[PDB]
């Protein structure tokens, strides 16, 4: 195994807004005088301490400003090694609204919005309409709509409702899924059918 190792080792790492991530860089070298160095390439570095672990970098109260690429560098015996890690800072609170608040037979459509979130790219941010856990068949998505409220986003997914039949399901469930490298979160909001 090569001399310079970082934990966690993944090339890109995720952290929640306002939360903290600590990254540990260590160098296995036989000569003393050996050292490593964290550096912020794209962003401000963060706080580095040299004792525990080996060289421990800590991002604290993470803001969107913390996202970006950082590298730890170190030489052993004349050979310089680097380890790059990219940090993603996301916002995904449990603020999921539905419109209408409750469904009345005769309602053509339903909308569900995830509030003050980021990122909002469909590969990471996805919506679903569910009934009894299963996606509601016949439901027709109209397409996401991205809006505002660091600047976060509100994202609205609208669904054309299918015939609900009898007995009408007791409720449908709007669900937002957040998928990022190493992250899968979901919030479900209820939709009472009256």
């Amino acid at each position: 195994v090569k001399p310079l190792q970082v934990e966690p080792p993944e090339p890109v790492v995720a952290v929640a807004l306002g939360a903290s991530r600590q990254l540990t860089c260590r160098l296995a070298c036989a000569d003393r005088g050996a050292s490593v160095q964290w550096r912020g390439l794209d962003t401000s570095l963060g706080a580095v301490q040299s004792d525990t672990g080996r060289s421990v970098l800590t991002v604290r109260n993470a803001s969107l400003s913390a996202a970006g690429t950082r590298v730890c560098v170190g030489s052993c015996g004349g050979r310089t090694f680097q380890h790059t890690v990219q940090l993603l800072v996301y916002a995904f609170p449990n603020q999921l609204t539905v419109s209408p608040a409750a469904l009345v037979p005769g309602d053509p459509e339903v909308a569900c919005t995830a509030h003050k979130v980021t990122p909002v790219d469909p590969n990471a941010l996805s919506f679903s309409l569910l009934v009894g856990g299963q996606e509601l068949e016949g439901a027709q998505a109209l397409g996401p709509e991205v809006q505002e409220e660091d600047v976060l986003f509100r994202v609205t997914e609208r669904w054309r409702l299918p015939p609900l039949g009898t007995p009408v399901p007791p409720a449908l469930y709007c669900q937002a899924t957040m998928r990022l490298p190493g992250l899968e979160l979901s919030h479900r909001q209820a939709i009472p059918v009256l």
Partner: antibody, heavy 124, light 113 residues
Framework: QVQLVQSGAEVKKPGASVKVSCKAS????????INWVRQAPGQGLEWMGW????????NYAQKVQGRVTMTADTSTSTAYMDLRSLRSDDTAVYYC?????????????????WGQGTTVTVSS | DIVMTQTPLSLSVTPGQPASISCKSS???????????LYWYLQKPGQPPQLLIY???NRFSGVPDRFSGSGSGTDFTLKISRVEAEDVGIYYC?????????FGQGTKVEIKR
């Protein structure tokens, strides 16, 4: 495109001194070290010395130890080889090359990007 | 200093024919961390040196699969399944395990007509 641009050819008298520069662009200067390797006319390659950009540590080859100083300037992304007490037998093309690993530290590539070289003609 | 000896130091290759270069170090290039630090460089006429193979058998970006590096311990071989005119120049091996880094004398490759 990762690039190392060296200063122009030099003529110096025997016993003088010369400082060759190596300006870095297209990559992170501090994530790689810098080697200096020379080639005397119609001759093989020979490693001359090494500067660790991030730490300031160096290592010199026997042929230049005691009369060379190599450094790196993080303010201008430039590395220097300073060779004093010049000999006719120092006449050579001097190359600088970045030296380092893959971005994860996974593989050690060695010298994957080279400067165009600098002709140093030690002559009277 | 580790001594690197290439044999032969001159190759004349018929277009299409394979070429083989031996590189032997006076001591093993395997490190305690498991890596074997043997590297191949090519210097074409009038041009700066370029990385050809890293860690015994990994071809650098842009290096055709007709170049293949192999070996372990103190004996290594660079093979070229075919030698095109663009391949002519001087090939060097180099150890990167123990300072000072040392190169072979360089094997000169030329087309045989």
């Amino acid at each position: 495109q990762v690039q190392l641009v060296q200063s122009g050819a030099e003529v110096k008298k025997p016993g003088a001194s010369v400082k060759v520069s190596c300006k870095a662009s297209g990559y992170t200067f501090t994530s790689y070290g810098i080697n200096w390797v020379r080639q005397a006319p119609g001759q093989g390659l020979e490693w001359m010395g090494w500067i660790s950009v991030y730490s300031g540590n160096t290592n010199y080859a026997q042929k230049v130890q005691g009369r060379v100083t190599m450094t790196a300037d993080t303010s201008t992304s430039t590395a220097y080889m300073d060779l004093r007490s010049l000999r006719s037998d120092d006449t050579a093309v001097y190359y600088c090359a970045r030296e380092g690993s893959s971005s994860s530290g996974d593989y050690y590539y060695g010298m994957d990007v080279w400067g165009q070289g600098t002709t140093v003609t030690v002559s009277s | 200093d580790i001594v690197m000896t290439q044999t032969p130091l001159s190759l004349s290759v018929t277009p299409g024919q394979p070429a083989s270069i031996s590189c032997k170090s006076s001591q093993s290039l395997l490190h305690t961390d498991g890596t074997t630090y043997l590297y191949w460089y090519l210097q074409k006429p009038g041009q700066p040196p370029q990385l050809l193979i890293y860690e015994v058998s990994n071809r650098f970006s842009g290096v055709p699969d007709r170049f293949s590096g192999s070996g372990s311990g103190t004996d290594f071989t660079l093979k070229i399944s075919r030698v095109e005119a663009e391949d002519v120049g001087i090939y060097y091996c180099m150890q990167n395990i123990q300072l000072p880094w040392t190169f072979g004398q360089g094997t000169k490759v030329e087309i045989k007509r």
